[PDB]
Each structure stands twice: as structure tokens, then as C-alpha cells.
Amino acid sequence: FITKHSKSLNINTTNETEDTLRSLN
Amino acid sequence: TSQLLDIIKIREVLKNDFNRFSNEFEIERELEECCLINSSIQLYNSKLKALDGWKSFINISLAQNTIEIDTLDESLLLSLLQRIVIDFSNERNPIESTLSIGYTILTILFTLKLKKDSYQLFINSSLTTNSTDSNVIEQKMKSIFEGLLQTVLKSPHQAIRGISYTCLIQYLDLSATTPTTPSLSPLSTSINNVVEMNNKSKNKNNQDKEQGYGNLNIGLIISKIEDKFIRILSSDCNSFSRGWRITAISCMQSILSIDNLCGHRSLMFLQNKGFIINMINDTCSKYLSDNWENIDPKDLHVYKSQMSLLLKISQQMDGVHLLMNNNVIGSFVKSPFLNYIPTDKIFGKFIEILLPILQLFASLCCYCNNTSKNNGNINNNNNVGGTVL
Amino acid sequence: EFLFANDIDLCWKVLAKHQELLKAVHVLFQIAERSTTLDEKILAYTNCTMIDAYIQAKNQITFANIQKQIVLQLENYLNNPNESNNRNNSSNNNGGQPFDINQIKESISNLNKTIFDITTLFTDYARKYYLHEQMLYLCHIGNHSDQNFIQILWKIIIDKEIPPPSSNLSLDDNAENDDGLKISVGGVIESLVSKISNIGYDFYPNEITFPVEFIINYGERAIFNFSRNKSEAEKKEISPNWLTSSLHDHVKIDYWILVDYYNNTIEKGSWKEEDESLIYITSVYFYLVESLINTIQTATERRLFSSKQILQSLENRESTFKSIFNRQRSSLNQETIKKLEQLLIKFEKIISISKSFKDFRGY
Amino acid sequence: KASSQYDPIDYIFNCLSNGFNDSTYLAGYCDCIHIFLNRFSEVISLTDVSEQHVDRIIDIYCMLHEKGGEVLSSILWSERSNDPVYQFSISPDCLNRNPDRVLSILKSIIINDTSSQAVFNELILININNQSSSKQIISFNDFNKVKEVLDITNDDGNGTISGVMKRDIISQSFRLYKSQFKSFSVINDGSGGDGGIEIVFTLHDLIIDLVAIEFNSFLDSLGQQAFFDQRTIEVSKAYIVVLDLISKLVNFTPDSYSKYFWQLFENNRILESIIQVYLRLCNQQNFTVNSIPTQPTLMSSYSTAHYNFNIITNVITSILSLFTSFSKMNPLPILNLLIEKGIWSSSPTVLISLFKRGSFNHLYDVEKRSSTTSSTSSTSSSSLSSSTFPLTKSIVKLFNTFINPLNQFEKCIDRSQYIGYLESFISFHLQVISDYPIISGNNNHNETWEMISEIFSALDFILNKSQSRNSILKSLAFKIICSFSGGILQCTLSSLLDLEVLQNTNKSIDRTSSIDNILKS
């Protein structure tokens, strides 16, 4: 999909694990 | 025209719609940004003024022969040419600036040909026995060729490719060596005497290396780029308007004179894109149909250059095969023009169109003679099925 | 004015033929505002990429197309709620609460009215509703660079197409009734290949969002782990080039590039820990080299396939496989032994071709 | 005020740099300037001077020993209880900040076996005691080794240990690496609050901690940042100084101590860690070069890119220095490790179809590019340094230590591969001869001509032992001779004519003892 003027996805993923991305808590 | 920001009208509208700003120091800063942008636009315009001055100064300092061509230093000219061929390859050019550089590259290459075709080039670096200095001269010449090819690979702009095609022709006319002297044959030498076979390897193992390396450097540049360079050039040979179409077709002729050193790959690539049959059909339908009397004299040079490319193809063994594998004789012989009995008021235009066909048809007879060397030294299964006629 | 007051859709077409391109675009932007669905807005912005402005319209199409994919998977969850639980239920009876059918319909109701930005699409929808594929598309569009998070998304995508290894329930042979779809070892591979190829096609050569070496090293390990416990009857549905052809055939990754991604996979990965796994990945590597030998045309390619590095990898791979095979030739069965003996004769031929393409230089 | 107009310290730095090299009295200048720095520091405390002039006082004090010889090293080994610059460098508020200062003084003092073995004792006598009231925490990797070794299953997370330990365990010294011996003390203040734990460790234990702890975390901060921070620059200075210090100790400490440094590095895998650093750094040079395009913000980024390149080139130079020093004593395992980690090859084709960033030919090509590109911007009048070749001159030194022991290697490697590794070494020596005119365009002629004397000395050794009964050396000597066509013979003849010109100009009595030994090679 790349465009040179998309909005960058400025998210902080550094606290996600395989658990927090697989589970419904 | 060049546009600047109207700092007065901007300052008045910013003071009418003041409602957008926390205070007037923001308005005066949005005006600071406009004053900075105007200052860099003014500097951009003066750098362009200075190129257009510099180009016209140099091309007049050459195109009048006001500097004696013997005294014109090739070490300086190749250092300038190598410098400016880099900016001639920059995708951030102005079109105007890249053209102004391109026409200056063209004049420097043409003045270097006018030196070669009057004087030996580089004499001061054969009067040095420095193998270093001729190595620096090849590395400059090569840095120019690999750069002119980058301008073709990068540019969408017809005239910037067109100038690079003229410069690539002049570069290949510069790099091609003059003929060796003819080898006189002492026809009376018929008797017995034994020894002076074995020493004859050595001196050819030098001069065939030394002509070999320059031509192999060109071949080892073309044979990295080939699939893209011959593809762009064979597109341009049918995608360009009139005058630059001729420049692309002339560039293709100059490359086919060298394609032997790649291994007939540009020729084979043209058949692997239908370009030979498509150019035959483009030739017969537009110049050898009933309206041949009405051919525009500007595009009669497009006909002559298309025919000179078929003549350059028939000057090769595989090229005679590839012209018969597109029925060249039968596909010209079907065309209305040849049925015309010429009459006096038009005879010169008939000869101008018949002569290149008779050159092409004579050229197809030439290669059909080399069958006679079949000494059966069996050993090795290199199954390259080249069609010996 | 008359068309902008009576027929706004004829208005922009007339303005475009009048060459008033920027006015046609300014009518089309106002269609994309006023419109009632996401579809009308994609059409109107697509016309603003047939007429700066172009890139802003193409970004709106880009967000709206992923926003449609979010809506589609939310309506699939509303229509098939028994499957969206039963694919997950296998490992624990931890019934994490099925999503509020009011909030999913409120999400769909708002996704169909307005385009959202990439971070709102990621946070309040794709991450909220565990849409890892649509989250990965948003990472690509947004150029997001967390290689660890991307590897976790790729793992959770692979582990959504592969059904988990069936545990030892009992052989109570009287259960005649239930057409509970026995997904074939073919059909698991067919779904997983399609999942990898069709995501790869929008991304490649983005090595951040399509990390080829990780996708290989985990995909082959997951199909190894799934297939290990299977019968030798089901280990005849598995293509030895199941991933390696589709990455070339669809994703256009060169077989030369794939060959050294598989050398890296075998040299770096946990394939050196178990004989059966090392036999498996070395078999895939030699069938990938068998594909490459059918694509090798030029004298230049023959002159690369005869390099010391390729020849020495093939001879190390043959020596490794031939060592492990004769370590296991006392425990393997009399079909699977022959399956490996017929592989060895291919590998010995492959090494012979790397040698003939080498000494095709003495003539 | 004097430093704010015309500084007397950088004057003395220019005095020791550019004044006295070719002086047959040189050590007498140093034995006077040492008494200036001391009688200055007897009147102004080095706590009361801005720390950039303190660093320059350390630069000068280091140059005083290296240019003064054993005449100053023996004065310091007898008066160091009284020397204020030395006593400042071993002070706790200097040691617990900037220990690269004392490690540079201990580097510069090494000149012979006597001063090398003296530094090896003093590194074990300097103990670092964290008795300043700043709670410096135990280095996290050794905090976790201490947590493992003591069953510390409860932790409070503050770098403290809120547990009723046995003093009969703590009254012992611990091996946090093999042949390291850190000691532990309980501060029993008299309040009955924190029973705080002190570590007592030597400047020798700290040399092991820099090389086997901090530099790994520095490698992963380098792995995350395109420009260096101030601490990344300071850790780089300290690591250059430590590598050169161990390199001098391995050159100049007698048999038992150079074998102790070998066995210390060997047993803790340190030679593999330093090669993983080398392989990362050689790849980061390919990012700091290939991010240059070919308002204040453009001068600051370009200056920082050049400064970071020079730091990487100096760290690799000190690695090649230490590998030269170890290969004088064990050439075989250093050669085999450069091959096993894939820096080197027995086949030119395998170099060409890998083009590995951090093969020796790639580092020469990078040093050739950074030294040639500087020639163009001849419009300003700043005091840039001349282009030097410290990396290539250290590669030659590392190859010469494999060449001198040739008659031992014949029983220790396969002859077919050992020919191939010597062919690639010879190919590198030949490339540096063919490119000589491109190198000698740089004004640092003495350094290049010495590097070529060090090349000619090694190729002469191969030729003069090829004339024996050894067939390995005859194949390699024939391959040297087959490479002496055209340009390699030309650039050799040019150097012999540049030598004829320079002995024809510099009849000025001041012929350096380098020139007439370059001729003698």
C-alpha cells in the first residue's frame, strides 16, 4: 500500500505480548 | 515568470482574520516564514541565472575555435565533463538546467572529437611511461559513460535522453581505435625453413589485450544494463518525435557496431521484442506505399535512418538470419513502390528510396560463404546451436 | 450551478470534460463528505485519483479500504458467532466475554459514515476486536517499525489458519452422526498459503511488515509441528514446495533470494535440535533448489550456481541429511526409508548439476 | 584569563606534538615540562580547573612519558607518592568518574619490560572503594550473578538486598569472571539502618568489567542510535585506552603475564565478544559513510558524522593493535578465529561473491574513500587533520605477525588452505602497493612510506625463505613475482624515485631514521 505522505502509525507497541494480543481478559 | 509571496497582502489579510491567532507575534512569525521562503526562492532564481550565464560563456568559448584545439587540455576537459555528467544524472534537476548542462556536455564531447580527428589525444600520458595515468584516463572516460547511461535510465524527458543519445554516440566514436596498418604479404616465401612460428603469440597477446580491455570495459557495462537500456532505446526509437527518433535510431546503429562484444544480445533482444518485424512493417506501410511521392522531406530522414539500421543488422551473420526470419526480401517486394516505372519530374526521389533497398538486398548476400573449416576436433558438448547457414 | 443543484454526479463528469479538473475534484470531495456509505466515498476519492490533492484522496481510499475490511470481519463475527468462539475455545474453557452486539453494531454504524485516521482505526477497532491481519495492514500503511510486535502479529496469523493439534479423545467407535468438517492437511496448507501470499503481495519488498525469513522459519515449523503426529497417509497431501512456490508464483520473490533465506533458516533456527525437523527443512531446501534448477537459463546463472558457496552448502546439506538418514535407517518404516533414499538420489543429482555448470568453462 | 586569549596548556601540547620529535635531547625537555605540570598542580588544584584543561594536562602528561622514555618512567616509579597529577588521577572523585585519565597515564608509562611489569603490579594495588555518599549501584549483570550465587529469592528492586545475610558468607572473595577476584564488605555504620554492601575491586578488576560487562550494553546502544551520546563518546575513549593498555601489556610484559592475558581472554570468550564488536562496527562505518550526500544544522550533522567515524576507526585500530600483540605470542588461534568468524578467506572468489562489510579489503576501501573525498572542499581555512591510514597500517602489522612464524604453521593447518589464506594476505599487500600514488596524495608521507616498509619487510621474508626447500613459500613467491607486472613494479619504482628526490632535497642533516630504513626495506 505505501505512500510517501501517509500518516505514520505513532503507537507504543513496546508493552504488548503474545498473551495481550491473543487473550480476552 | 517566478512567483514571490506578497508580504503586504498577507500581513493585511492576517490582520483582518486576526481571530485565528493567540497574539500578533504569531502573525509577524507567519510573515517571517514568508520572508525566509522568498529569500530562498530568490537564491534559487540567482543560481539558475548563474548556470544560464556559465553555459553560454563556455559554449561560446568553444564553438568559435577561439582557443587553439591543440592547447585545449583534455585532463581539464575530462575533469569538467566527469563533474557535470553527475548533475546531468540528478532526478532533482530543473529541466532547463539539466538541458543547459546537457548542451555543454555535447559541445565538450564534440570539441574532443575535433581534437581526435586532427591530433592524437593524451600524448602527454604516452610520453609518461606511467601505467597509472592511462588508468586514470580510462576511469574518467568510464565514469562519463556509466553516468550518461544513468541519465537515459532515469529521465522521462525526451530531449534530455536525446542529448544523452548524441553524447553516447560521440563517446563511442571517441573510444573506438583507429585502424591498424595493413600486413604486407611476401608471396614468394615457399621453402622449408622452420623456426619462426613459435614467437608470434607474444605481441598479439599484448595488442589484442590492450584494444581488448577498453572494448571489454564497454561490453561489461552494456551487459549489466542491456534488458533496460536496449528496452528504453527500442521504445524511444518508435515513441519519439521525428528529429529525436533519428537520434535514437542512430544510437541503436552505434550500439549494434559493438553488440558483437556482448555476444549479439542487443540484436537478439530486438527480435525478442518484435522490433525488427515491427520496424519492417513501419517502413513498408509509410514510405513504400502508393503515396511515396508525398513523403515529407523531414521524415525522409526517418526512412533513411530506419534503412541504415536494417543495413547495420545485415552486416552481421545472425542479422542476415534474423532479417530472413522476418521475410525481409518478400515483405519489401510486396510493397506498391517497386511497381512504379519512374518518370523524369520525380526520378531523384525514386532513386533516394530505391538505393537503400538495393543496399539492404545486396548486404543479405554477403555472409553466406563461411562454411569451409569443419576440422572435426570432437571433445566437448557445448550445445550452442548457432545456425551456420 | 444547475448540475451542482440537481445532478451532482453528472456535474463533476461535465467539469472533467471541460478540463476544469480542480472543480471536478472539489465536487467529488463534497460527494465523499455528503455520502451515506463507505462505498460511495471510495468511488468519489478514486475519481480524485483519475483527476497534493491526488495523494490526499489516495490516502482516503487506503484508509477506507482497510475500514471496509474491519466492517466485513465485524459482520462475520455477528453472523458466525459460534465459529468465532469455537476456533478459540480449543485450548481453555476461558470464555472471555463475546463482544457486545450493540457496540459492534455501533462500530459498524460509524465505520460506514466517515473515514477514520490510521491510529483511530488501529486503536478503537482493529486492536479492540483482535483483527491482527487488519492491524498488520495499518502497520504497513503507517510504516510502523516494531519488528517484535510485527513477528507476534505474523505468529498469531499463522496460528489462526493452522488448527491446533487434536488431543487424545477416546476411540468410542459408535459416533456415526457428526459431519464436523475434517479439514485436510491439504486444506490447512491451502488456507495458510493464501493467507501468506495475499498479504505478501501488498507489502513486498517491505522487510519490516513482510519479514520473509521469520515467515519461512515459523510457517515451516508450524506445518512440521502440525504434520509430525499425522499419519504417513496424510503426509502425502503436503507439497515439499508448499510455501516456496507461492512466494515466487504470486509474491515474486526470486528463487535465488529464497535459497539463502532457507540457508539462513537452517543455519540460525532450532532445526539443529531434532533429526526429524532437520530432515524436513533440508528436504524443502533441496526441492526449492530443484525449482531453481528449472528456472536457471543464462550462462550468468549457471556461473552463479557453480559458486563455491552454493556448491559447499549443497554438499554440507547432503552430508548432513545422509548422516541423519543412516542414524535413523534402523527406526524408520519401509516406505519412509525409500522416500528418503529417492530424495538422496535427487540431492546427488543436484550437486552433479552445480558441478557440470562449473566445468562448463573448460570449453 | 590567559586561557581566554592564548592558552599556555595547549601551547605545551603543540610543544610536545610539533616541536621536539627529531631532537637528540628530547627526554630533557620532558623532564622539565613534568616539573612544570607538577609545580603548577602544587599551586592550583586540578579540582579548581575546568575539566577540558584537566584532560589536556593528562594528554601532555601521557606524551611526557612516551617521549621521555624510562628516564621519566623511573622518576615516576620512585616519586609517585609525591607527584600531584598521578595522585589526582588515583583520587576517588577522579576514579569514580573518569578512570580513562589514570588508564592513559598507565598506558603511556609502558615502554619496556621494566615499566610494563610495574604497571601490571600497580593495576592490582589501585583499589576502587565506593566510600563517597553517592549510592552507585552494583553493575546489573554482576548484581544478578551475586543474586544467583547467594539464593537471593527475595529482592526489593532498589539495588539493595533487604535480607539477614551470614557475615561468614560475605567474608570471602568471588569469581564474577574466571581469574577475577572481587571482594565484599559490610558497612556497619553504628545507626542500625542500612547494613550497606561495599565492593572492593582493583583497577585490574575494572579493566575486566569494562571489557566483559559495560561494552556489551554499549554495543546494543550503538545498535539503536545513528549519532552517539556524550556517554557513548566517553565509553569509547575509555575502551580505546583499555585496548591500547592491554595491547602494550601483551607486547612488553614477559612470557608469564602475556600468557595470563591470553588465558584470561580465552577462558571468558572475550576474543569472540571483541570480534562481534568489530563485525558490528565495520557495518556501522557503512552507515556513517553512505549517509553523506555525494543555517547551522548541516555543519553540526556533518561534523558529528566525521567525529563518530573517527571514533569507530580508532576502536577498530585498538582491536587490531591488541590482535597484533596477541598474534606475536599465539598467531595460530588468532588466524583461525578471523577465518571462523568469517573476516578472512582462502579464496578471492569467496571475497568477491560475499563483499562482507568488515573484511580487511572493505576496511582499506573505506579508509581510501574517507581520505580522498576530503580533497575537494578547498574553500575554507580550518585546521582539519591530514588523512592518516591507522587502520590499514594496523592490518599490515596484524599480517606481519602471521608471516614471521611461517616455518611453524606448516605442521598446524592444511597446506592447501594455508596457501589460500597467504594468497589473500599477499593480494592485500599488493593492492596497497598499486594504490600508493592515491595514498601519497595525502601529506602524511612518513606514515604511508613506513606502512610500505612494513609491507616490503614481510614480502622480502617470504621471498628469502622461498629460496629454501619449502614448496608453500615457492608457490607464494611465484605468485608475488607474477603480480609484479606493470603498475605494481611502477609504483615500487616511483617510491624509489620519490626517495631519490627526498634524499636530494633533505640534505638538511635532519634525515629521519625512518627514510634510510624505508630504503633498507
One-character DSSP codes across B18-34: GGGSSSHHHHHHHHHHH
Give contacts of C203 with chain A, Cβ < 8 Å: 1
Element holding D197 (H helix, E strand): strand D197-202
What backbone torsions phi and psi does residue D134 show, to the nearest 5 degrees?
A: -75, 110
- Residue D437 in grid coordinates: 600514488
What is the rounded CA–CA span in Å between residue D350 and residue D190? 69
The residues facing D199 across adjacent strands are D184
Judge whether B383 is closer than 8 Å to chain C, CB to CB.
no
Residue B184, Cβ density class (10 Å: 0-12 exposed, 13-18 middle, ≥19 buried): exposed
Which subunits sit against A, judged by 3+ Cβ pairs under 8 A? C
Distance (Å, rounded) from C-alpha D415 to C-alpha D66?
42
Q: Do C138 and A9 touch (CB under 8 A)?
A: yes
Contact C214, C243 (CB under 8 A): no
Q: Name the residue in chain A with its Cα closest to that of C122.
A: A9
According to DSSP, residue D17 is labeled H
Q: Nearest residue of B to residue D494 by CA position?
A: B130
Give D-chain residues touching B131 at CB under 8 angstroms.
Answer: 486-487, 490
Q: Is B311 exposed, middle or buried (0-12, 13-18, 19+ CB in 10 A)?
A: middle
Is C308 close to D347, i.e. CB distance below 8 A?
Answer: yes
Please give the residue of chain D at the shortest CA–CA distance from B129. Answer: D490
Length of chain B: 389
And the C-alpha cell for B310? Answer: 536494417
Burial D65-93 (b: 16+ CB within 10 A, else e): bbbbbeebbebbeeeeeebbbbebbbeee
Tell me, yes or no, if B192 comes closer than 8 A to chain C by beta carbon: no
Instruction: Please choose, from the candidates B196, B335, B316, the residue with its C-alpha nearest in 3D space to the C-alpha of residue B262.
Output: B316
Quote the Cα angle for D349-D351-D357, to 5°: 160
d(CA B282, CA C281): 55
Largest separation between any pair of C-alpha atoms in chain C: 89
Nearest alpha-carbon partner for B282 in B329, B274, B264: B274
D490 and B CB contact within 8 Å:
yes
- HSE of C33 in the Cβ direction (CA atoms, 13 Å)? 7
For C220, C246, C248, C285, C314, the CA distances from C241, given in Å and listed in that order, are 10, 8, 11, 9, 17
Residues 6+ apart with CB under 8 A from D382: none
Strand partners, D463: none
The total of other beta-carbon atoms located within 10 Å of residue B195's CB is 6
Quickly list DSSP for C259-271.
Answer: HHHHHHHHHHSGG
Q: Which residues on C lie below 8 Å from D354 (Cβ)? A: 309
* Cα–Cα distance for residue pair D420/D473, rounded to 1 Å: 12
Name the minimum distance, in Å, from the CA of C263 to any CA of chain D.
15
To test the contact with chain C by mutation, choose from A9, A19, A25 the residue with the greatest count of C C-beta atoms within 10 A, namely: A9
Give D184's strand partners. Answer: D199
> Smallest Cα–Cα separation from D150: which of D140, D163, D139, D137?
D163
For D43-51, the CB contacts below 8 A with 24+ separation are: D46/D84, D46/D85, D46/D88, D47/D93, D51/D98
Task: Give all chains having 3 or more CB-to-CB distances under 8 Å with chain B.
Answer: C, D
Q: Which residues sit opposite D359 in a β-bridge?
A: D357
What is the CA angle C262-C267-C270, rounded to 5? Answer: 100
Chain breaks in chain C (C to N over 2.5 A) after: 51
Hey, is D174 helix, strand or coil? strand
The pairing of strands D173-174 and D127-129 is unpaired
**What does the DSSP assignment read for D119-157?**
HHHHHHH-EEE--SSS-PPPPHHHHHHHHHHTT-----S
Chains A and B touch (3+ CB pairs under 8 A): no
Report how far residue C204's alpha carbon sits from residue C197's, in angstroms, rounded to the nearest whole number. Answer: 10
CA distance D485 to chain B (A): 10
Closest CA to B265 of B227, B238, B234: B227
| Chains B and C are touching, with contact defined as 3 or more CB–CB pairs separated by less than 8 Å | yes
Largest CA distance in chain D: 84
Provide the chain C residues 42-61 that lie in CB contact (below 8 A) with chain A.
55-56, 58-59
Mind giving me the DSSP string for C118-156?
HHHIIIIIIITTT-HHHHHHHHHHTT---HHHHHHHHHH
Contacts of residue D134, defined as CB under 8 A and 6 or more positions apart, other chains included, come to D96
User: Which secondary structure element, helix H or strand E, spans residue D391, and what is its range?
Assistant: helix D390-403
- Nearest CB to A3 within list C55, C97, C202: C55
Amino acid found at C192: L
Q: Closest residue of B to D294, CA-based?
A: B86
CB < 8 Å to C362, chain B:
380
Closest CA to D116 of D323, D16, D255: D255
Closest CA to B219 of B264, B257, B184, B262: B262
End-to-end CA distance of chain A: 33
Q: ω before C205 within 30° of 0 (cis)?
A: yes
- Which chain C residues are closer than 8 Å to A25 by Cβ? 96
Is the Cβ of D254 closer than 8 Å to some Cβ of chain B?
no
The Cα-based distances of B156 to A4, B107, B240, B336, C47 in angstroms read 20, 23, 12, 38, 25
Contacts of C309 in chain D (CB under 8 A): 350, 353-354
| CA distance linking residue B119 with residue B116, whole number of Å | 5
Inter-chain CB proximity B379 and C363 less than 8 Å: yes
Establish whether chain D is in contact with chain A, requiring a minimum of 3 CB pairs below 8 angstroms.
no
**What is the rounded distance in angstroms from the CA atom of residue D338 to the CA atom of residue A13?**
39
Rounded to 5 degrees, what are φ and ψ at D200? -105, 120
Amino acid identity at D139 = S
Distance CA B364, CA B319 (A): 9
Cell of D27: 627526554
Question: Cβ(D378)–Cβ(D304) under 8 Å?
Answer: no
Q: Which residues pair with D186 in a beta bridge?
A: D197
Q: Residues before each break in chain A (C–N > 2.5 Å)?
A: none
At residue B189, φ and ψ (nearest 5 deg) are -90, 70
Smallest Cα distance from D354 to chain C, Å? 9
Q: How far apart, in whole angstroms, are the C-alpha atoms of residue D325 and residue D250?
A: 6
Closest residue in C to B378 (Cα) is C363
B132 interfacial to chain D (CB closer than 8 Å): yes
Q: Is D439 on the interface with B (CB under 8 A)?
A: no
Partner A contacted by C302 (CB < 8 A): no
Please tell me if residue C37 touches chain D, with a CB cutoff of 8 Å: no
Cβ distance B160 to B240 under 8 Å? Answer: no
Burial of D20 (0-12, 13-18, 19+ CB in 10 A): middle
Residue D440, amino acid = S
Q: Which residues of D touch B130 (CB under 8 A)?
A: 490
CA angle D485, D489, D491 (to 5 degrees): 130
> At D235, phi and psi to the nearest 5?
-60, -35
Nearest to B169 by CA among B255, B234, B285: B255
C147 close contact with D: CB closer than 8 A: no
> Which structural technique was applied?
cryo-EM
Q: Do C308 and D349 touch (CB under 8 A)?
A: yes
CB D203 within 8 A of CB D123: yes
Question: Which residue's entry shows cell 503436503?
Answer: C238
Strand order in the sheet with D182-186: D127-129, D197-202, D182-186, D173-174
Residue recorded with cell 553523506 = D292
* Residue (of D415, D349, D418) closest to C311 by Cα position: D349
Residue D22: CA count within 13 A, CB half-sphere:
9
Q: Which of C260, C309, C361 to mutate to test the interface with D (most CBs of D within 10 A)?
A: C309
Judge whether D491 and D434 are in contact, CB under 8 Å: yes
Sequence-separated (6 or more) residues with CB below 8 Å from residue D331: D401, D402, D405, D408, D409
Rg (CA), chain C: 26
Query: How far is the alpha carbon of D397 from chain C, nearest alpha carbon, in Å?
Result: 30
Q: Cβ–Cβ of C309/D350 closer than 8 Å?
A: yes
Q: Which residues, other chains included, contact D517 with Cβ-Cβ below 8 Å and sequence gap of 6+? A: D453
For the four alpha carbons of D228, D233, D235 and D239, in that order, the dihedral sign comes to: positive
- Separation CA D361–CA D384 (nearest Å): 26
B153, B90 in Cβ contact below 8 A? no
Beta bridge partners of B288: none
Using a CB-CB cut-off of 8 Å, the residues of chain C touching D347 are: 308
Q: Cα separations (Å) of B276 from B40, B251, B334?
A: 51, 16, 17
Pairwise CA distance, residues B279 & B283, whole Å: 6
CB-CB contact of D306 with D228 (8 Å): no
Question: C142 and A8 in contact by Cβ < 8 A?
Answer: yes
Asked if C362 has any chain B CB less than 8 Å from its own CB, the reply is yes
Give, for D185, the enclosing helix (H) or strand (E). Answer: strand D182-186
Nearest by Cα to D206 from D149, D130, D276? D130
Angle value at C-alpha D296, between D294 and D300, nearest 5 degrees: 60
At D43, the amino acid letter reads V
Which residue does chain D place closest to C312, by CA atoms?
A: D350
The C-alpha atoms of residue B118 and residue B114 are separated, in whole angstroms, by 6
| Residue C211 and residue C151 in contact, taking contact as beta carbons nearer than 8 Å | yes
Neighbours of C220 (CB within 10 A): 23
Task: Say which residue the cell 472539489 belongs to.
Answer: C26
